[model samples]
Target: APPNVRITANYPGASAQTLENTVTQVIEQNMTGLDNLMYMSSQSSGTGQATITLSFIAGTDPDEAVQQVQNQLQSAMRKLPQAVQDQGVTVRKTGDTNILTIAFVSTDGSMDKQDIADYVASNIQDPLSRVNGVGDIDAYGSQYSMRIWLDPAKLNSFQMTTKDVTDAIESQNAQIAVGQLGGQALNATINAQSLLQTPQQFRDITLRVNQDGSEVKLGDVATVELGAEKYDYLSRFNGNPASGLGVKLASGANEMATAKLVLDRLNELAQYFPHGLEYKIAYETTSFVK
Candidate 1:
């Protein structure tokens, strides 16, 4: 039997944290028939990807248990907001893993922590993800996020409350699918949709429009730029800033062999790096299988 039933979904233009929170609520609401839920875990990336996993306690009917959980999930998902439901959720069974970690560590003095993180996420992550047998590529350290530093004076100048800015952002920083229009005569197409794709877009949003057509904007009141979340768990390696990957091998793959392939792949990719940067595998679970 598969080690777990995997439920994965992508709200491509949604906040990772938001989706993760909602998915957690889904699990929390469905405690019935949950005795066999040995492990339930989920995470999200700033790039708008997230997953939820469930592993049953051993010795149960895996089939029935999976179906039961899925049924509950269906019910829980419906409780989400109507707009969110249009994004859809996916359900699937995934092979298990005895996890191993690979820290692509770098601590270049010239490059800051956020720089290292952006490089890793942009260059290494997607390339490595395509490697056969590689399961989820969990980002083990901080990735860049936007920091909105608000100044009370500027807000007061616009005669706006804190909630004004907050409400404007929440209301506009989204892609709302107003569902399809047209029936048999026309191909179904989305009626109304608007997506704010970047920090600049958020900054560009109009905060308050005056009767004379003069407008106050987010950028006028605040700065929005690439930054990190208020992170409680910062990671490091060899006394230098680091971003790591928890690379899980798919079940049934030979752990050692897969590890070697991954290592070799990293080595092959290393030659492309500049003189100051290097990639190293700092951990592997296969090394413990003595």
Candidate 2:
């Protein structure tokens, strides 16, 4: 059986009329075995999201079906409102049940995994999430950690242990609700807590007791740093170090278009990173189509 085609539209700063037209045109143009059409708007103004689905008519060529859908989208793009038109948009095949894979390697494996991961998530994932036609952004194969740099002399003087430091730090890095206030028929909530306010806090924290019951501040024993714990997660090539970023598109998105837009934004953001930090698409999947 031919798989049902799914189309997801993500548009921030677009109007309901525009989205309605786009969806209408898509359905009108490809009116064969239409299965489902779903629409959703971003809770925040200037954001929109939607998904459309259609089953392939019996004996319809999958490639042809995809091409026809793509063509309709191209036409719609020409007519879409300028606000929607300017946004990064994509249409890709997904959920076809045929697994496709691609892989590439970074130049260096020694870089901090958490740093790399953070860079990708913050620098790459966050911005991409705001782009039109992007429903969700996911990354894989990155590592995260809390690093502890210790001085043996300080450790001995303070009589503190690493375990003590780890425990205290872990205890601090937790989420908690502050309290709630209520009046006649009215209530308000407040949640407040510090989850590791600073690296210095991690360092200055008193971890354990001395032989004589004196306080053992973390600064006396070791430097507590939070970062990539393992270097093994990265890949290295030549003599330079690089990190790999994997991007997964939201459901019902255009694959190639999303990849291109993501790459463009990544290149723009790359300029802000230290000169050595570079990114290349290690892998990408083909678009999903009926």
Candidate 3:
């Protein structure tokens, strides 16, 4: 017997109610009736939701059951609902499917979640985004704020060039070191020192040196402000908590099988996450069998 089994039932004209009835009948008639069945589900392509039923039967060949179920479903499609018929519903067996699908509709109807996630994550940190098989890292939640950009015109009036302001800021903000010499008795070694230990140090930089040797503080010329990063997308969890989805797939791998592998990796990684970072499998198409 195959370790895993999947069956796709396509309905061209039957109502969901009728389809359910047909599946129920098939379950009761073949093998050892519904009691011998494992899990089963029906999904509508248009709505992306499952409607059928699933159950497990002790010591049964899943592959055989799936084949019988598929044959039955093919017969029921002739009597399906008109609406479904118009939409051309299809059912296909899924293997290890773990899709984190996010839905967003634009007024002009031209937005795609995968496209948006790719754009946002790529621009935010290109290096981090280049990780292998990293697909569709959705952007959502509170924004991250970064360094303040000082206006050039305002700095110019203060007799400071943009380079002058940047240099001052960088000098105070960056950590640097000078080489240190070794001792006479022990082997020679070099040591260095770091600057800018804190944010306050960066905020306190002097922009220039006066002719009289007085210091010109940066505060005199630049305005510092904290604000959100420019972002075009927003994300939230399933109406309860804050969360984001990460979809991954291996190179040249079977779609469903790759999904299972990604989930396993995620499970292993989850052990290192903090308590509040706990997550649940919202939806998974793969089954774990003994």
Task: Report the poorest 10 consecutive residues by lDDT, candidate 2.
Answer: 180-189
Residues 1-290 of candidate 1: C-alpha lDDT, one tens digit per residue: 54466554445455755755665445444534576666565555443434555677667775465556655766766665444444444444454332545555554655555666666666776666677777645553432234455666776676766435545655664631111110000000110122654667767878778779998787777776543232212245567665555566676577677677766787788778654565555343221100
User: Considering lDDT, which of the candidate structures 2 and 3 is the better prediction for this target?
Assistant: 2
Residue 85 of model 3 has an lDDT of 33
Question: Model 2 segments beyond 4 Å from truth?
Answer: 1-110, 141-233, 237-240, 287-290
> What number of clashing residue pairs does each candidate have, in the order they appear?
0, 21, 11
C-alpha TM-score for every candidate: 0.41, 0.32, 0.28
Which pairs clash (backbone N, Cα, C closer than 3 Å) in model 1? none
Candidate 3: where is the Cα deviation over 4 Å? 1-143, 146-154, 173-202, 228-235, 238-240, 243-269, 274-290
RMSD of 2: 22.1
- Tell me the whole-model lDDT of each prediction, alpha carbons only: 0.52, 0.42, 0.37
Which candidate number maximizes lDDT?
1
